[PDB]
């Protein structure tokens, strides 16, 4: 409603780096909000794409940011008869970035990992990795919960049970308010998907540099399944955290599985122990229900609601049989044990192939009227296909079915304007929460500021 | 007054054989539609599916490791396909294409270094390096070329169960000059697989976020060039390209994914699903049954309909089956001529004093081009 599309602050990154692919806000110890931007295609030390993270301080002019330095050297260690080796080439560092209090969690989902013991090996595969950083203190850590030393033939014997070799941990990530780093790993358990949770303090304390295969004590992983509805579900493609069981002493995980049950798609609510509290099923095959999940209180009743993006949802038209426009499903949480049933509102795209629902950003109370608001991105929407971000204001009965504001892409076509979104935080400190939009195809980040 | 004047009305043909490009399966072929503001005028279209119409059967075969038995059953397909398709058409062209999946981690086995030239290294056998889609045989009427080309095909091996089959469908659809799709012919794309399929946004597990643009990327090497740099297509883009190229996709899928591909074919017009055996041994009768089943249904589709214009159809199927609201007629056979009473309504009087849209059956180049003039 009041996001200003004229005075735009553009942060830019290296060309081809996919700057803006993932972005969060970082509040310094002094409270000065910076923008964490992930660029999974930043060139490393040997001109190889290794990814990077840029800590962009808030300046109303934008421009280039200083990179946040991580170790990008492929490590190799002999621990016993096994050679442990990590591969940072095309690891995608910055494909998801989340910032806790003073920690920046930068995840490299496609970081590969192999274990050589003899003529046998552990099948170099994208186990993923998250790089933790305290930028004000300079302290660095790492968290790869899916690294193992089990060899390939052992997995072939077990019929590939508990196979975390293709996790891609940090594909999606979220830090709970208590400080637990929840990682989505949609390739975990042979592409069934898993969640990896460990406290950030326990990741920083358990991390020894040089040691490649260690175990966080407080680390908790999801469970494997033989139910064929979970096969290739990509559980953990998107993760969120909310309050969906009344007990405000526990944190509920909101996991999107966009190909769950033969590409139908699901979003499961769970507790800290990965027991499925509720499961929301996709409305349409191959619509990618669960591609993005947002947890906001859009109707001001204190109970967190669930917004699920289905960016490949096909609606009914005349000149097009089924028009892939995308859809966002709003699930208002009612006063009850679970009570989460049918979507209380359906936001659908209008541009064909616009991918409406790829990102859903809780904007907080954008216009400060008592109801939290929502930004949904169509990274290829708008009448030109360059990308839109649509601001949906909350009301007493959910959201507004019509966007109060559309933010058209200030970048050329292919920029994927809106692929990453981030709101609810006030960069310029004028009392109104702002929106940070990431166009990784333009390698830029647009900063929309909310007017009074 | 608002009228519907018929400009081109060639009578429907009786046989699709002989001199083609004169075979008219839709009548009329052009209509001038004058509509005063906020008015409605009705016109009629006849859609006959003629007999002995030429067929293009591009066999798009999953060549993952589970399909090494199927290559023994396809080895004489093409001669048997020519013998069985000889009663259904007088001009048959068959082609062959193969897919496995995007040759990139975590779909492709990336270690040991010997598992890149031989993904079957851990199976202790030898297959081809993983490919995403390779065009093998351009649609040709020399049906022994199909046998010659499938006898020299080998499978590859990937890691996960979903395949890159929709990537291959997109490439076999949009590379129409490379595949060999004739204009005046039925375009049967026989998509055989025994596994789930990858869809858009699945390529992000490999680092591939760039959406499928639907362009041709099969070069002179006959391989899909954008397999590792471009995402999988969605059902929307793949359906749009199948509709633009008039291609009747046939899911020849094993019983473990028959329900998945039926739920897909419900979302893709012009598609049928046949149950493939675990060794593709019933694929000839599957193709024949799916050609008879695709031609057992006339479904209309509207292309580039103006926003101010709406359409309503009254499908005049089998003699007394006037079915309102339907732009389809199931339960047909080759030779049945169905009718559709279409009614175009305006919503106001737009700025453009003359627009144009086309009404065609799904899977045919024949169309009714309605030139709509707003006076």
């Amino acid at each position, epitope marked *: 409603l009041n996001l200003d599309p004229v005075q735009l602050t553009f942060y830019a990154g290296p060309n081809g780096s996919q700057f803006g692919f993932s972005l969060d806000f970082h509040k310094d110890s002094h409270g000065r909000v910076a923008i964490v931007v992930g660029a999974p295609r930043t060139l490393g030390p040997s001109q190889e794409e290794t990814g990077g993270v840029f800590l962009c301080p808030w300046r109303a002019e934008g421009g280039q940011c200083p990179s946040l330095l991580f170790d990008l050297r492929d490590e190799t260690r002999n621990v016993g008869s096994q050679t442990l080796q990590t591969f940072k080439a095309r690891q995608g560092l910055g494909a998801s970035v989340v910032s806790w209090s003073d920690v920046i969690v930068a995840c490299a989902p496609w970081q590969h990992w192999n274990v050589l013991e003899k003529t046998e090996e552990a099948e170099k595969t994208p186990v993923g990795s998250c790089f933790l950083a305290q930028p004000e203190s300079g302290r660095r850590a790492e968290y790869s919960p899916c690294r193992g030393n089990t060899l390939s033939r052992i997995y*072939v014997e077990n019929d590939f049970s508990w196979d975390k070799r293709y996790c891609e941990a940090g594909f999606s990530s979220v830090v709970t308010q208590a400080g637990e780093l929840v990682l989505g790993a949609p390739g975990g358990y042979y592409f069934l998907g898993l969640l990896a949770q460990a406290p950030v303090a326990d990741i920083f304390s358990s991390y020894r540099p040089g040691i490649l295969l260690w175990h966080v004590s407080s680390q908790s992983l999801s469970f494997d399944s033989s139910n064929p509805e979970y096969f290739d579900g990509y559980w953990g493609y998107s993760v969120a955290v909310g309050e969906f069981d009344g007990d405000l002493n526990t944190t509920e995980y909101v996991v999107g599985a966009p190909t769950w049950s033969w590409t139908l798609g699901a979003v499961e609510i769970l507790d800290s122990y990965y027991q499925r509290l509720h499961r929301l099923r996709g409305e349409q095959m191959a619509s990618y229900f669960g591609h993005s999940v947002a947890v906001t209180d859009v109707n001001g009743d204190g109970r967190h609601d669930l917004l699920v993006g289905a960016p490949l949802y096909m609606e009914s038209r005349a000149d097009r049989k089924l028009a892939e426009v995308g859809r966002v499903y709003l699930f208002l949480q009612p006063r009850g044990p679970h009570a989460l049933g049918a979507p209380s509102l359906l936001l659908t795209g209008t541009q064909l192939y616009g991918r409406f629902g790829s990102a859903i950003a809780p904007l907080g109370d954008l216009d400060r009227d008592g109801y939290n608001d929502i930004a949904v991105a169509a990274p290829y929407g708008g009448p030109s296909g360059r990308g839109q971000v649509l601001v949906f204001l909350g009301q007493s009965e959910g959201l507004r079915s019509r966007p109060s504001q559309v933010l058209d892409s200030p970048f050329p076509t292919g920029s994927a304007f809106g692929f990453s979104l981030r709101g609810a935080v006030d960069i310029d400190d004028n009392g109104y929460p702002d929106l940070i939009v990431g166009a990784y195809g333009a390698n830029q980040v647009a900063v929309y500021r909310a007017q009074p | 007054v608002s009228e519907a004047r018929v400009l081109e009305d060639r009578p429907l043909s009786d046989k699709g054989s002989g001199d083609s490009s004169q075979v008219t399966q839709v009548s009329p072929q052009r209509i001038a539609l004058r509509l005063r503001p906020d008015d409605s005028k009705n016109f009629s279209i006849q859609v006959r599916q003629v007999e002995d119409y030429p067929v293009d059967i591009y066999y798009l075969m999953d060549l993952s490791y589970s399909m090494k038995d199927d290559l023994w059953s396809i080895q004489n397909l093409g001669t048997k396909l020519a013998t069985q398709m000889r009663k259904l058409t007088s001009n048959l062209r068959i082609g062959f294409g193969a897919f496995v999946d995007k040759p990139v981690s975590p779909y492709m086995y990336i270690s040991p270094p010997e598992a890149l030239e031989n993904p079957c290294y851990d199976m202790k056998t030898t297959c081809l390096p993983m490919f995403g889609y390779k065009h093998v045989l351009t649609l040709t009427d020399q049906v022994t070329r199909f046998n010659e080309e499938v006898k020299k095909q080998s499978v590859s091996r990937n890691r996960d169960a979903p395949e890159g089959g929709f990537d291959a469908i997109m490439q076999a659809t949009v590379c129409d000059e490379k595949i060999g799709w004739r204009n005046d012919a039925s375009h049967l794309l026989v998509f055989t697989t025994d596994a789930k399929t990858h869809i858009a946004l699945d390529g992000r597990l490999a680092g591939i976020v760039q959406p499928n643009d639907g362009q041709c990327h099969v070069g002179s090497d006959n391989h899909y060039s954008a397999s590792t740099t471009m995402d999988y297509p969605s059902l929307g883009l793949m359906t749009e390209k199948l509709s633009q190229k008039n291609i009747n996709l046939i899911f020849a899928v094993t019983e473990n994914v028959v329900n998945l591909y039926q739920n897909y074919s419900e979302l893709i017009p012009g598609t049928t699903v046949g149950v493939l055996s675990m060794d593709s041994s019933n694929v000839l009768q599957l193709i024949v049954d799916a050609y008879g089943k695709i031609r057992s249904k006339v479904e209309l589709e509207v292309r580039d309909l103006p926003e101010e214009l709406s359409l309503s159809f009254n499908a005049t199927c089998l003699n007394n089956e006037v079915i309102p609201g339907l732009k389809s007629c199931m339960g047909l056979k080759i030779g049945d001529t169905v009718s559709f009473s279409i009614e175009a309504k305006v919503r106001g009087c737009p700025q453009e004093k003359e627009k144009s849209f086309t009404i065609k059956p799904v899977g045919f180049k024949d169309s009714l081009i309605v030139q709509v003039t707003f006076d």
Partner: antibody
Amino acid sequence: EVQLQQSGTVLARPGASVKMSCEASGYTFTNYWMHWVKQRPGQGLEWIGAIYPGNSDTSYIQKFKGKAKLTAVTSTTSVYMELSSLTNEDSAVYYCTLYDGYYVFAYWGQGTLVTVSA
Amino acid sequence: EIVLTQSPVTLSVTPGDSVSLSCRASRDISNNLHWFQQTSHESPRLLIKYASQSMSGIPSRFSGSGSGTDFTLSINSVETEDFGMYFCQQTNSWPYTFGGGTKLEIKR
């Protein structure tokens, strides 16, 4: 035409070692894995392992790890199997077998009989 | 490994009668089940590949059937050349295993 030609019958003694060959002709030698199968007289067939003549990489059946050892000599296109610490349970017919383009083991050696009587 | 259990262990059939040899896998090996014949005049001879595909040059009396975990080898009219040992073999997972074997006797 893939033909597998093994060595002849070889008498041995317990605790000793026996090396049997398999001359592979009719296909590109280093490309394909060579598989070895054991069949005790009157009993069933038991897979021993495979050898990749390209990089001389070998993978055995856990029952045969340490007992059987596979080596390849790509100059003469021969695969050698060496049984170590022979017992009377090693007196069997050992076949080298190969798969075809359809990945079924249609090509077998005539078999090398081993006798560990002492 | 995938255990292939053949039944019966031995089987007496009159020359000209019909036989049905069974194989049962520990797990799903879809059609990756092959049938070998060994009457000791040569190495094991592959009769039916992929559980239903007769090899070239194999008599038309040998028939394969089955999928998943239960497979069958049927002989229409056993000749004097068919009496021997029949092994089912899986090439689904490595290590590749054989069945216990099934002898065919003449049953006079």
